[PDB]
Amino acid sequence: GEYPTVSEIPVGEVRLYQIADGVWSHIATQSFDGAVYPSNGLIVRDGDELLLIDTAWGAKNTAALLAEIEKQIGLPVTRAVSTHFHDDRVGGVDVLRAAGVATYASPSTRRLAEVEGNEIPTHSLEGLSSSGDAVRFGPVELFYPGAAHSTDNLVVYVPSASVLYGGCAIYELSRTSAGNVADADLAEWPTSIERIQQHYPEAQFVIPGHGLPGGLDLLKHTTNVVKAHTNR
């Protein structure tokens, strides 16, 4: 159908969107700093259970995500992966943990989360410490492209559906300016996106951390925006 926007989503609520067989995005909204912005995560079917990529941003949003999963899919979320250490991706980890979800992130993510005073996913993902590293995690591949929006950002690929979840390292087409880039490596960002490009040239669906999915041109768009900001 039509991809959900802040319009179709009351703040505190979560919509699911089916991208492919056994793949969904989860879309939530958050009011920051006067404005309302949407946020995407992923859900991937793993036999008779569910792998969750990223929290719905907050303990209350995350509890609403689980309820909305329990309602629309009715399969249990057994594992969750946070793609970076910011609160929009780990906020709700405690809720997940209380519901019996095993929470995972790279050591680099866990370290920064700890330093940040954020919630810390329980389990460590080994083998992602070097730019270009990939590891399998059930029905997805996890990929560390190098520093971009943050030094720890991961991307997620669903081989079975050619879905690339970029997380916050990839911007939607609508987004004309770099956001908060305080934690970013602007100097390495484009090289990291090129790694993503070179590793997943067959991706059919590209999901940005925020906003509307597209194809692989989201990667060039983000390059273009990051480079204009570098040049500001």
Ligand X SMILES: O=C(O)[C@H](CCCn1c(-c2ccccc2)n[nH]c1=S)N(Cc1c[nH]cn1)Cc1c[nH]cn1
* Whether 53 contacts 19, CB under 8 Å: no
Catalytic (active site) residue 86: yes
Q: Which is nearer to ligand X, 209 or 213 (CB)?
A: 209
Judge whether 86 is annotated as a binding position. Answer: yes
Dihedral of CA 97/103/107/111: which sign? Answer: negative
> Cβ atoms within 10 A of the Cβ of 49, count?
12
Between residue 10 and residue 49, which ones bind ligand X under the rule CB under 6 A? 32, 37
Q: Report, in Å, the least distance between residue 63 CB and ligand X.
A: 18
Judge whether 199 is annotated as a binding position. Answer: no
Judge whether 229 is annotated as a binding position. Answer: no
> Where does this chain touch ligand X (CB under 6 A) — which range of 47-55, 81-89, 139-147, 196-204?
81-89
Residue 119 binding target from ligand X, Zn ion, none, CB below 5 to 8 Å by type: none
Considering only residues 45, 195, 210, 221, which one is a binding residue for ligand X as defined by CB under 6 A? Answer: 210
Q: What is the set of active-site residues?
A: 84, 86, 88, 149, 180
Task: Give the interface with ligand X as residue ranges (CB under 6 A).
Answer: 32, 37, 86-88, 168, 179-180, 209-211
